[PDB]
Design a protein around this ligand. Structure first.
Ligand SMILES: CCCCCCCCCCC(=O)OC[C@H](COP(=O)(O)OC[C@H](O)COP(=O)(O)OC[C@@H](COC(=O)CC)OC(=O)CCC)OC(=O)CCCCCCCC
Ligand SMILES: CCCCCCCCCCCCCCCCCC(=O)OC[C@H](COP(=O)(O)OCCN)OC(=O)CCCCCCCCCCCCC
Ligand code: HEM
Ligand code: HEM
Ligand code: HEM
Ligand code: HEM
Ligand SMILES: COc1c(O)c(C)c(C/C=C(/C)CC/C=C(\C)CC/C=C(/C)CC/C=C(/C)CC/C=C(\C)CCC=C(C)C)c(O)c1OC
Ligand SMILES: COc1c(O)c(C)c(C/C=C(\C)CC/C=C(\C)CC/C=C(/C)CC/C=C(/C)CC/C=C(\C)CCC=C(C)C)c(O)c1OC
Ligand SMILES: CCCCCCCCCCCCCCC(=O)O[C@H](COC(=O)CCCCCCCCCCCC)COP(=O)(O)O
Ligand SMILES: CCCCCCCCCCCCCCC(=O)O[C@H](COC(=O)CCCCCCCCCCCC)COP(=O)(O)O
Ligand SMILES: CCCCCCCCCCCCCCCCCC(=O)O[C@H](COC(=O)CCCCCC)COP(=O)(O)OCCN
Ligand SMILES: CCCCCCCCCCCCCCCCCC(=O)O[C@H](COC(=O)CCCCCC)COP(=O)(O)OCCN
Ligand SMILES: CCCCCCCCCCCCCC(=O)O[C@H](COC(=O)CCCCCCCCCCC)COP(=O)(O)O
Ligand SMILES: COC(=O)N(OC)c1ccccc1COc1ccn(-c2ccc(Cl)cc2)n1
Ligand SMILES: COC(=O)N(OC)c1ccccc1COc1ccn(-c2ccc(Cl)cc2)n1
Lengths: 51, 126, 93, 49, 385, 62, 385, 126
């Protein structure tokens, strides 16, 4: 009968919670493009297998 | 803001209790006299903010005769305040006239919004 | 353009309040009355009446914070005198 | 080195602005006299409507 | 119809200046927004006429400002007006904000108007800071040193941010030339935020001192509130003229008439009077990183107020308890400025700590608890059984 | 009560309205405020424009 | 309704960018206004990043620009982009104006939109002139000398205007420091005129190449004309990059790499390519006062066109005679630039006189006479008795 | 712009005159063919600019059947032009169909505006 909410229902949280992980990625994707060449983060930005 | 359903739940508990009512009511009466809204010719329900849907609903359901008087009390108070005077003491709202004339229309609109809103997020059994 | 999401205030003719019935308004021209008419019976009646109401809400707070600044400023000047050098080396550690 | 000129231009500026401030108080209270003495009366209508 | 209503450009002037409906009962506290608009015009105009004679090189900067004072015709009028005009701009803004806090203007339906205002405040502290550094005296050098070295505590990234802000390894010539070009810019961004601020007011219009609707009695703007605003324009110009022409250096520090020297530290590094309460909040936090967070948090805790006021009535006019704690908060904000102008010594260390707590507890603990108590007292005084 | 009864306005009314005079005093004050503010506007503009003239050091090398 | 239609700020974006009704038949000549908006962003951003390293003193100015080229990281990119970006801004504006002249966009109901545009053009010539003087090479000094000495011919008042413009008795240090502060300002005034320009377009919307109503077939802006505008943005950024990186000094003069010297005159004082046609109009008038009037009259004769076109049809698409004389006027405007880059010698003296006449006779004598002839030919070809 | 009353006054003078009509009419016919509005399927009165009160009046007084056809010719021409093609040669307007269907409604609205305007600025005798 009862599910709790603040306009953001508990199973309105977990029908978007995967996509939160995915858009948490979409911003991970969005800044490790943005800040290579900035001399700081270089430490672990060309740790990749090539390059 | 806080719901009038919650305000009434706390108040009724205080009032039904003998010890708490003998201890919290005189404080509340002199809080009313020090506020000074009767001296401008207003009842308390004139002061409630009206820019929200539950309160817009309550004002439509109000009878015509009570609604015309509310408009006059509000105009009279604005004019009293731009002159920086008070009204004559024979035009002050008395205690027996400061009634909650709008509270039943508010509690009815609130109870319907909660029932509708529980029904839109129900967990069903099988 | 298109209409946007509406408000709690309109314009002249459709301001958006309740319907009024049974109220009458009267007024007189300013050219037909005298200005600067009573502004004593104003600064001595109403200003003193308005002061007398809203002055214990402003002055009891002001008295608590000013007393606090005092006892601190008095104590500091004692610490850095020669009679209060022993206390300074106690509290500064 | 501007001390003497500055104190004499400030006498001109303070006299002019002080009279404009008093003239503005006069003009306001005249143009506001209709609103301050306006009166209202209520006669409760019949709730037929 | 009339031309003022049909023309594309005059229609906006008419709807904002001439025919705008205003509540009949608004008082003189509603006149501060007009003054802040004249203030911005004074500063932009006086500043552009000085920029014609200013040089930003670190070896030429202090002597350019003394050249405006001695050799430029009426240049002492431009500077003192400009320098004291910024002190007046900040005083009218604190009174404008304190009003809205008293009369509940932050509440819905005007939450968007309060938030654009918080932005204007941040961009205005930034502007004034950048301009004081361009004098390049002895409070200019060591004030920029203390604030810019705060960003060297951000984890793993801080020492890259300070060297990019400086353009080198210390406050030097590249720092002073970039701070002047940014100081010219930000005033034009504030003006664009002032237009967005007015658009959000036109939707619902203004509130009034009683906290109830104003749609039953409205007066047009022209020739009731235009002439009411002249009253406060001329009082503002009078008091400002009295500082510019008769006491033009009382709202400053003498050390900034000494030229800037990296090799001699002053005995007391003190900001202007309008940044002292925020300077006391910073000094109260022993850790460097937490201090710079707590200082910026002091500006952005204002955005939390629309959700912590739990009252059904707008404003404080009929509220007894909420009046007492409004004036506690005002005089606690004046003590923080005083403590920010003192030496770091007993007992001014603990005083600024307790007062930094009271600044934050007002928005987060006091307002919710008194608002709820006041609601329930209104109920049991009328409905008693 | 009837709407044809005008209420009491005898606290605020004049000697005799005397339209020759009621207009006299209001427009002397509106005229003085326009005279002083037009002179003040003219001193402000000339102060800003004169700042663009040759400085003292440029006139010394004249 | 949708949030983009209800919010105060996004409602303006939606009405101007997303849901705006556009005629179905507009071609790629309607894409120039978008480019002029990107141009203004390029110049303002590149200029603010250079102002961090520039010094306006006459003894420091030329060497500050060479310091941006050699010592500043990527500073050669900022300058060449900026210098060649102004040449591109002017070329897109001439094509934008020539379009409106061809398709009749000046006519009623859009007379107000044409007039705000003429203002933008004047303020844009002023901006570019002030910036070239801040380099302070040898075309910078002697170009400001020639133009500022023109105002000494105004009757009884002229020699007071030049000395107030100079700040002295010649182009000197006070002149170069005031021209830089004004050069930063005027771009922000152009931006405010661009907003007023767009407000006047929203009333009646855009025209179309046929010159008839477009209310019977409309397409929204988003995803038909947004993606049609990307096509020309990337072509603009390609051709500009080809000048910045491979030929960055072909649209300039070598003398401006010589530092400014009042004691050595160049053998040829020549403006940039985009002010040469107006420079030939000035040189064509033997008298000094009439010359400076005729030059400014060349910009403000555009305001006379809404009253001299006497045709019942909008635009030139179906007009044979009015097409021939549109292209006479275009190539007469290219000859004036060529003659403005020549020495004052036979026969380039008389050529520029006859061509200055044809510039003025087009707006005042040719358009009224051919428009009336074309109206009457349409009538007698259909109604013949 | 020029009035259709003035356009008709000049044209009628040219047409009634034999020598001028034999000299100015062939120029006008080939001015029409070189313009090329028939190749998009338009009559000349489709081209007249309509953003003025005399022309808004003429379009209301137009019959319904002639008004529906005008709307279709205008839509068809916009579509023909965004494709950068011409219509088939069997859909071109012929000369006998290019009639002034709207001119009488224009001349009637113009003559009434001049009569009204003269009457608003009259000099009276005594
Ligand atoms: C830095 C300079 C900036 C320039 C302007 C600053 C003005 C800010 C002052 C604060 C404010 O705006 O509120 C003031 C408030 C009274 O406002 P109210 O509408 O309720 O009362 C209308 C009046 O009765 C009718 O006033 P009336 O319109 O009839 O006459 C005009 C009056 C001029 O008063 C003013 O200019 C108001 C600023 O004429 C005279 O006073 C004659 C004597 C020469 O008064 C109070 O509630 C308490 C005032 C004391 C606290 C002030 C502390 C501020 C730091
Ligand atoms: C980061 C942002 C932080 C900002 C912190 C802000 C601190 C800035 C300090 C500014 C001081 C201004 C205080 C007053 C606030 C303005 C609003 C106000 O106080 O309301 C006026 C009120 C009117 O009286 P009523 O309650 O009867 O209502 C009107 C009738 N319907 O009447 C009153 O309430 C009393 C008015 C008297 C005001 C003077 C009291 C303060 C005196 C010393 C202050 C020192 C400041 C330097
Ligand atoms: C919101 C607007 C502005 C504020 C609040 C502001 C603030 C300040 C302050 C506090 C100072 C230091 C005063 C001192 O000398 O003690 C200053 C200096 C200066 N400002 Fe501004 N400023 C503003 C706008 C401008 C603009 C737009 C310009 C340039 C066009 C400008 C140009 C200058 C210059 C040249 C100085 C040098 C020092 C002096 O002349 O006093 N200011 N500014
Ligand atoms: C700095 C430039 C500013 C300008 C030019 C400006 C201008 C104005 C004006 C003209 C008004 C209407 C009149 C009035 O209520 O006084 C107004 C109202 C208001 N302003 Fe500002 N303001 C500025 C800054 C701020 C700031 C810093 C805040 C808050 C942090 C703010 C919040 C508000 C609010 C809430 C109102 C509505 C008050 C009400 O209707 O009761 N403004 N502003
Ligand atoms: C409509 C916008 C602008 C136009 C059309 C424009 C035009 C010009 C031109 C033609 C030059 C000379 C180019 C050369 O070196 O040969 C120049 C130089 C310069 N401009 Fe601008 N400008 C604009 C905006 C700005 C702004 C907003 C600033 C400052 C914030 C600025 C700063 C400079 C500086 C510092 C120079 C020095 C010489 C150089 O670096 O090339 N410009 N400008
Ligand atoms: C910074 C300079 C300018 C900007 C950013 C700008 C922007 C625009 C834009 C976005 C449009 C939309 C339709 C179109 O692209 O044709 C437009 C139209 C127009 N502009 Fe501009 N413009 C500028 C300068 C001018 C100038 C200098 C003129 C004329 C002297 C002018 C006259 C017009 C006219 C008449 C139209 C309407 C054309 C039509 O609808 O057929 N504009 N402008
Ligand atoms: C037919 O209909 C159309 C239409 O076709 C088009 C294309 C557009 C879009 C075209 C336009 C021209 C509008 C674009 C707007 C402008 C050109 C005005 C730009 C105004 C400015 C003030 C630009 C300034 C830009 C900045 C980035 C200033 C800030 C500077 C910074 C961040 C650099 C300095 C910072 C640091 C930290 C050093 C329309 O709006 C439109 O209307 C319906
Ligand atoms: C509630 O109703 C109100 C209301 O009460 C008020 C008071 C206002 C009034 C205004 C404001 C509150 C603020 C708005 C102000 C701005 C956006 C300020 C813009 C500021 C400027 C300084 C622009 C300056 C531009 C210039 C070109 C001048 C600079 C330099 C010059 C002239 C030197 C060059 C000179 C020569 C000779 C070369 C309203 O608009 C309003 O409507 C809502
Ligand atoms: C929104 C901001 C509110 C404040 C705006 C203040 C701006 C001042 C404009 C006042 C215009 C009054 C309308 C004129 C009129 O009705 O007829 C005027 C009446 O007013 C005047 O004579 C001028 C009086 C005051 C001088 C105006 C400048 C004040 C100082 C400006 C300081 C910079 C802000 C004509 O006189 P008459 O009606 O008798 O024929
Ligand atoms: C404003 C006047 C027009 C001038 C041209 C405007 C250029 C800037 C806007 C760029 C178009 C973005 C719209 C895409 C969209 O929202 O639809 C998105 C597409 O987004 C995507 O996933 C594909 C990536 C977008 C490609 C971006 C291309 C260039 C971006 C800027 C280049 C630098 C200037 C689809 O959703 P929609 O169909 O409902 O609109
Ligand atoms: C840009 C900042 C963002 C906010 C918007 C700014 C709005 C404030 C503008 C201030 C008012 C300006 C006064 C305009 C005077 C009346 C204009 C007019 O007569 O319209 C035109 C003529 O205007 C012009 O030719 C050029 C005006 C350029 C003005 C440059 C300042 C009259 O034509 P019309 O009678 O058809 O009125 C327009 C009907 N929509
Ligand atoms: C012409 C010059 C000036 C005018 C500029 C107009 C064009 C500017 C484009 C602005 C981009 C969009 C800005 C934010 C849009 C969302 C606003 C919003 O959600 O409103 C508020 C949030 O309040 C804010 O914090 C405003 C921050 C403003 C940010 C300053 C850039 C909540 O949305 P709200 O309920 O008010 O919308 C009503 C529709 N139901
Ligand atoms: C825009 C700046 C306004 C700042 C006002 C603040 C008060 C300080 C005044 C400093 C003014 C400098 C000129 C001066 O000293 O003149 C002085 C005269 O004093 C005045 O009249 C006061 C002027 C202010 C009245 C209001 C004018 C309205 C604004 C006009 C905008 C078009 C001396 O000038 P003088 O050369 O002797 O003629
Ligand atoms: C008017 O100028 C001064 O008083 N300055 O600066 C030279 C000064 C002078 C001496 C000592 C300290 C200062 C600085 O004090 C402060 C306190 C807070 N901020 C700040 C600055 C930027 C931003 Cl975004 C947010 C907060 N600055
Ligand atoms: C880009 O800069 C140059 O080409 N400049 O200026 C240093 C130059 C260089 C050498 C020779 C001549 C000039 C000037 O040529 C012109 C011709 C007309 N204007 C003008 C200027 C302002 C105004 Cl409001 C209106 C018209 N200027």
């Amino acid at each position: 009968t009862g599910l709790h909410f603040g306009r953001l229902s508990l199973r309105s949280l977990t029908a978007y919670a995967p996509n939160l992980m995915l858009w948490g990625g979409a911003s991970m994707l969005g800044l490790f493009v943005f800040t290579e060449g900035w001399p700081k983060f270089q430490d672990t930005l060309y740790k990749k297998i090539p390059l | 803001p806080q719901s009038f359903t919650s305000i009434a739940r706390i108040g009724d508990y205080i009032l039904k209790s003998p010890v708490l009512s003998k201890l919290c009511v005189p404080v509340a009466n002199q809080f009313i006299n020090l506020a000074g809204y009767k001296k401008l010719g207003l009842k308390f329900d004139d002061l409630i903010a009206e820019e929200n849907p539950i309160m817009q609903t309550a004002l439509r359901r109000l009878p015509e005769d009570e609604s015309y008087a509310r408009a006059y009390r509000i105009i009279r108070a604005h004019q009293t305040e731009l002159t920086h005077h008070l009204l004559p003491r024979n035009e002050w709202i008395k205690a027996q006239e400061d009634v909650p004339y709008l509270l039943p229309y508010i509690l009815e609109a609130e109870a319907a919004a909660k029932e509708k809103d529980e029904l839109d997020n129900i967990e069903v059994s099988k | 353009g298109p209409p946007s999401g509406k408000t709690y205030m309109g314009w002249w003719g459709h301001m958006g309040g309740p319907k009024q019935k049974g109220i009458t308004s009267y007024a007189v021209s300013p050219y037909a009355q005298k200005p600067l008419q009573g502004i004593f019976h104003n600064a001595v009646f109403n200003s003193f009446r308005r002061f007398k109401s809203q002055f214990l809400y402003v002055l009891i707070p002001a008295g608590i914070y000013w007393y606090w600044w005092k006892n601190g400023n008095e104590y500091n000047e004692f610490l850095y005198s020669k009679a209060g050098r022993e206390e300074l080396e106690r509290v500064n550690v | 080195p501007e001390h003497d000129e500055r104190k004499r231009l400030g006498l001109k500026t303070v006299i002019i602005l002080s009279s404009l401030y008093l003239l503005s108080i006069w003009v306001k209270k005249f143009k506001w006299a209709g609103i301050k003495t306006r009166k209202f009366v209520f006669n409760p209508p019949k709730p037929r409507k | 119809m009339a031309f003022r209503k049909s023309n594309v450009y005059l229609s906006l002037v008419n709807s904002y200046i001439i025919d705008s409906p205003q509540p009949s009962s608004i008082n003189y506290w509603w006149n501060m927004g007009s003054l802040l608009g004249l203030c911005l015009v004074i500063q932009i105009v006086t500043g552009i006429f000085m920029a014609m004679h200013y040089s930003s090189n670190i070896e030429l900067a202090f002597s350019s400002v003394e050249h405006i004072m001695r050799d430029v015709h009426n240049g002492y009028i431009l500077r003192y007006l400009h320098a004291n005009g910024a002190s007046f701009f900040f005083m009218v803004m604190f009174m404008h904000m304190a009003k809205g806090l008293y009369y509940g203007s932050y509440r819905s339906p005007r939450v968007t108007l309060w938030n654009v205002g918080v932005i204007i405040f941040i961009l205005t502290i930034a502007t004034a800071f950048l301009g004081y550094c361009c004098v390049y005296g002895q409070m200019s050098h060591w004030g920029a040193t203390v604030i810019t070295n705060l960003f060297s505590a951000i984890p793993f990234v801080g020492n890259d941010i300070v060297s990019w802000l400086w353009g080198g390894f210390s406050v030097s010539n590249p720092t002073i030339q970039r701070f002047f070009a940014l100081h010219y810019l930000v005033p034009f961004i504030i003006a664009a935020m002032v237009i967005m601020h007015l658009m959000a007011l036109h939707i619902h219009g203004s509130s009034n001192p009683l906290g109830i609707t104003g749609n039953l009695d409205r007066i047009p703007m022209h020739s009731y509130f235009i002439f009411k605003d002249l009253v406060t324009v001329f009082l503002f110009m009078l008091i400002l003229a009295l500082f510019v022409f008769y006491s033009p250096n009382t709202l400053g520090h003498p050390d900034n008439y000494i030229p800037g020297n990296p090799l001699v530290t002053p005995a007391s590094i003190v900001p202007e009077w309008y940044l002292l309460p925020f300077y006391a909040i910073l000094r109260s936090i022993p850790d460097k990183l937490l201090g710079v967070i707590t200082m910026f948090a002091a500006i952005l805790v204002l955005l939390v107020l629309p959700f912590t006021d739990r009252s059904v009535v707008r404003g404080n006019t009929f509220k007894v308890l909420s009046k007492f704690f409004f004036f506690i908060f005002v005089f606690n904000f004046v003590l923080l400025g005083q403590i920010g102008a003192c030496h770091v010594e007993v007992p001014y260390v603990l005083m600024g700590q307790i007062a930094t707590f009271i600044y934050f507890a007002y928005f987060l603990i006091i307002v919710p608890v008194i608002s709820t108590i006041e609601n329930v007292l209104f109920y049991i005084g009328r409905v008693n059984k | 009560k009837s709407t044809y009864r005008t209420p009491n306005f005898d606290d605020v009314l004049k000697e005799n309205n005397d339209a020759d005079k009621g207009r006299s005093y209001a427009y002397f004050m509106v005229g003085a405020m326009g005279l002083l503010s037009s002179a003040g506007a003219k001193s402000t503009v000339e102060t800003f424009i004169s700042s663009m003239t040759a400085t003292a050091d440029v006139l010394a090398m004249a």
